[PDB]
Amino acid sequence: IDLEKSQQALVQKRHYLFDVQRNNIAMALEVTYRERLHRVYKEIKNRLDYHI
Amino acid sequence: DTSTWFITITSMIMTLFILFQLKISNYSYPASPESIELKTQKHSTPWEMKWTKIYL
């Protein structure tokens, strides 16, 4: 009994953490694209603030 | 009485020690039965360790 569940324990463990590695890198590209759209507004706000 | 001459019994004693080494050789010791329970425990524990290594 204890070695039958030892089969099934590693097949629910592995598919959870192998999609966490999908989504831990998925957030790494959104927060570097959201900060790409935001920064290009910041360095054109400096010229909208300087000449006044 | 003080009997004599001895050519008798002593050749009929070593035929007897083919009998007594036949009967008493087929006996059973209670202790040997406690030894076979020990090796069955360590084998499945290593087999579970072979299953734990099949996990790890």
Swiss-Prot record, chain B:
Decide whether keyword Transmembrane helix is in the record. Answer: yes
N6-succinyllysine modified-residue sites: K50
Where does the chain cross the membrane? 4-20
Q: What is its main location?
A: mitochondrion
What compartments host this protein?
Answer: Mitochondrion membrane
Post-translational modification N6-acetyllysine, affected residues: K50, K53
Record keywords: Acetylation, ATP synthesis, CF(0), Hydrogen ion transport, Ion transport, Membrane, Mitochondrion, Transmembrane, Transmembrane helix, Transport
Q: How does it sit in the membrane?
A: Single-pass membrane protein
Q: Name one process (GO BP) from the record.
A: proton motive force-driven ATP synthesis
Q: Which domain of life is it from?
A: Eukaryota
**GO cellular component terms given for this protein:** mitochondrial membrane; proton-transporting ATP synthase complex
Which molecular function term from Gene Ontology is one that the record holds? proton transmembrane transporter activity
Q: Which family does it belong to?
A: Belongs to the ATPase protein 8 family.
Q: How does it assemble?
A: Component of the ATP synthase complex composed at least of ATP5F1A/subunit alpha, ATP5F1B/subunit beta, ATP5MC1/subunit c (homooctomer), MT-ATP6/subunit a, MT-ATP8/subunit 8, ATP5ME/subunit e, ATP5MF/subunit f, ATP5MG/subunit g, ATP5MK/subunit k, ATP5MJ/subunit j, ATP5F1C/subunit gamma, ATP5F1D/subunit delta, ATP5F1E/subunit epsilon, ATP5PF/subunit F6, ATP5PB/subunit b, ATP5PD/subunit d, ATP5PO/subunit OSCP.
Q: What does this protein do?
A: Subunit 8, of the mitochondrial membrane ATP synthase complex (F(1)F(0) ATP synthase or Complex V) that produces ATP from ADP in the presence of a proton gradient across the membrane which is generated by electron transport complexes of the respiratory chain. ATP synthase complex consist of a soluble F(1) head domain - the catalytic core - and a membrane F(1) domain - the membrane proton channel. These two domains are linked by a central stalk rotating inside the F(1) region and a stationary peripheral stalk.
Protein's name in the database: ATP synthase F(0) complex subunit 8
